[PDB]
Amino acid sequence: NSVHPCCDPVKCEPREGEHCISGPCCRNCKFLNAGTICKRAMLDGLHDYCTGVTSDCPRNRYNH
Amino acid sequence: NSVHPCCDPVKCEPREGEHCISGPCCRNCKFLNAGTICKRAMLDGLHDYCTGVTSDCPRNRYNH
C-alpha cells in the first residue's frame, strides 16, 4: 500500500542502514545473499541467482 | 539437444524410476523437494514454491 517501510521520503532513498526498497532479491529492505536463486530455469540447470549487490534478478550470463 | 536422458521413447514417459522430464522444479529427472522456491516475487514475500508432485512452478495461491 502507502509509503514504503524501506523508503526515505525526504531523500527518495532507502532509510539509512537499509539496502533496497523492493525486488526479487530484496527482502526487508536488505539484499539477499549472493547466490540465492531468484528463479529456476525450464531446464539446463542455468538458474538466475541473486548478486548480493542489487535488488533485481539477473539473467544468468551463460544464456545467449 | 536430441532425445532426453529422462525420456522413454517407446512409452513417451520418463524412464522407469525417474519422476519427470524438465521444468523449474524438475532436476535430473526427479522432482525438487516441495517448498523449494522456484521464483521470487517482486515484493510481498509471496514466492512461488515447488510442490514436490509436479514439474512446473505454481503461482502462489495467495495472489489474486
Side-chain angles (χ1 to χ4, degrees):
Chain A
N1 206 138
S2 336
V3 241
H4 217 346
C6 303
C7 183
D8 185 326
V10 310
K11 9 185 90 167
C12 218
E13 224 127 55
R15 44 174 260 225
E16 156 110 2
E18 329 274 324
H19 302 158
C20 44
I21 307 294
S22 64
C25 299
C26 188
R27 146 177 305 222
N28 296 322
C29 315
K30 322 262 218 197
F31 288 142
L32 284 190
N33 199 330
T36 295
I37 298 171
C38 49
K39 196 196 164 175
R40 297 211 174 238
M42 292 305 321
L43 82 310
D44 31 47
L46 283 176
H47 311 317
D48 298 351
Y49 300 98
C50 289
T51 72
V53 301
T54 63
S55 24
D56 72 312
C57 187
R59 162 169 256 254
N60 192 315
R61 306 288 117 135
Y62 287 98
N63 279 337
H64 326 264
Chain B
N1 206 138
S2 336
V3 241
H4 217 346
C6 303
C7 183
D8 185 326
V10 310
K11 9 185 90 167
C12 218
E13 224 127 55
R15 44 174 260 225
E16 156 110 2
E18 329 274 324
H19 302 158
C20 44
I21 307 294
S22 64
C25 299
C26 188
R27 146 177 305 222
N28 296 322
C29 315
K30 322 262 218 197
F31 288 142
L32 284 190
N33 199 330
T36 295
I37 298 171
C38 49
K39 196 196 164 175
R40 297 211 174 238
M42 292 305 321
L43 82 310
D44 31 47
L46 283 176
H47 311 317
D48 298 351
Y49 300 98
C50 289
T51 72
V53 301
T54 63
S55 24
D56 72 312
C57 187
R59 162 169 256 254
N60 192 315
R61 306 288 117 135
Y62 287 98
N63 279 337
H64 326 264

